[PDB]
Amino acid sequence: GPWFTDGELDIEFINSLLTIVWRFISENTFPNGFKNFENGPKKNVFYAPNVKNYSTTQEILEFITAAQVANVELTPSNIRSLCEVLVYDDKLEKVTHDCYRVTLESILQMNEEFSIFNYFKMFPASKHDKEVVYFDEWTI
């Protein structure tokens, strides 16, 4: 693939390409896109279950060919592999072979009661606090 730069990976190229593919899929899988989530949590809307909100591999390949930001030709295996990297990050999900759809958690990650899933909304504890809980403790 084109990711091999001087014998190793080029992580900046990976991040930019994954961001633009996730951007495209999120535009397709939602009615109005991120602006639909921009105004507030309650005014947002979602597609009906019969709507084909999933994005296939060919549409993604055509979009990344038209964008010409990679500057290198892309095989469908390569775009499939990087979308597999995306679903490994739990940014999107696969509902059918060669079919993907952005999850809502990755949408909320960009921008009440405690839950583990919205951990980014939680603030770090103040210093000089004795009763603070560490995951690394009991095994250090």
Partner: protein
Amino acid sequence: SEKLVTPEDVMTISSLEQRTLNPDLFLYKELVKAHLGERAASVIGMLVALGRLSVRELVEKIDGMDVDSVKTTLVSLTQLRCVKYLQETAISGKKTTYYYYNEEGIHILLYSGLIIDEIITQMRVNDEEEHKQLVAEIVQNVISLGSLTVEDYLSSVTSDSMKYTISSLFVQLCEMGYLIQISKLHYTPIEDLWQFLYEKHYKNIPRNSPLSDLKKRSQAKMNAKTDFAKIINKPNELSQILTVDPKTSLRIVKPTVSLTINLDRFMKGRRSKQLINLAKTRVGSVTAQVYKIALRLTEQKSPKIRDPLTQTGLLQDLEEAKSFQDEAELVEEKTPGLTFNAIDLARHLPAELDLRGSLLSRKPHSASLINSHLKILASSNFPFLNETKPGVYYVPYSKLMPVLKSSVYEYVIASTLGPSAMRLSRCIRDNKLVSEKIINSTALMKEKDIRSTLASLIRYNSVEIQEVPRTADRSASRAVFLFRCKETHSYNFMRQNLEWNMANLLFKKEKLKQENSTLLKKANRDDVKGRENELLLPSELNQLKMVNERELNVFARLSRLLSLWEVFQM
């Protein structure tokens, strides 16, 4: 601490002495010592450490406590349902009572305020202050006294209308499953009960049967299984509420029955809350409200968190394991009170909920929109709902709880060790056994990042190294190391880690209260309460404020751990 830290400081400011304790023993002893006294803590600790013990063995194993003190603290523990017992007679005719420890009472002590808040929330009495306060006080009295009778509770109330409202609230608690009838079932162990039933139904089969030994064992265990199910399902049949119309034709629970808190129903509610929180991150917010209404409607008749037959040691047969799986899958679906439709959910939606514009079809509590929400719930990647027939839905717990466990565990890893750790863990879990090169090819990030991240993941049993030796002696240089992800080891280790964290937090809080005991005793007086700013020094006031804030933060962090620990109890 950039400078050198002496072992004095390591021992006195860190938790090194608490890292050598078993998390179960540490948590149970800390909870019992916090709520009950030190003698009960010693008894519970010895019961956890040595297993089952008689009263004589508890006397001879604990120094400084005689038979009267042991019996008194055993009575105190038994009233709060913290100790199970079994009275057995040997062949020689001697009768011995062996006392166990049961996690039910300790979890009741651990979940107490969460239980009270759940009772307050789940019967929509938040609008009415009198009903809310009465429900809170009766639940607190039930938990603090372990089990109580309605007649004894009402003997302390003099107003007739107040007595009627208390009886009505007790009936309302009983009908929705939160208060049940206590019995010797809740004090007898599950393993001993199944052993007794199996032995009885094995000796019931007469001699000289034509059928073989395996068939005899299977028949005896099937009869014991149905008898065990009938025995366990006894307190859920509302036999203690059947006393109707003594006068003026109202339904009241009997004044000669002992009611107690039901932990299984509370854990069902906690499971429903966890599933709601999981669904909030996949399918919308209005869809989450519909899922919440559907789960709260079918919460009481949902299957139990842990099937007790799995705790009888019967899982040593593969056929029994798959039979348990099949029975759970059948009972999650064909229970009459579990299936629901859009019309059933339409009668329980709140007035503020609209559903009108939440759906866009193409690129007033209507049944079609509710059905669309249930469809997008059932069509999501996570199996939130399954459709036996078009238009009817049920919650597939046996196929949803592993997904909830995996998601919670993965997001704990993502929040602690970083998102790259979550990516590596999911890459290893996707394709089961992989090498480093295959990881680098499938997961596009740097090889040294792969190695450091998996080395970090190894320490918490997240990733297990499979060594493939290529020589006669398994040298590390000549061998090749693959990586696999084992779910059970990781879940067990994370459960133990969170349990130890809860125990350490409780220990820290107890130490702080013990070292500020003088100020806390001065402040916790009837006259001083409500007049703290006048009868106390400003330094004492600041110390009291700091101590109370620290205690509040401790209990909030304990609640947040409990929201993160019960998932691995499922």
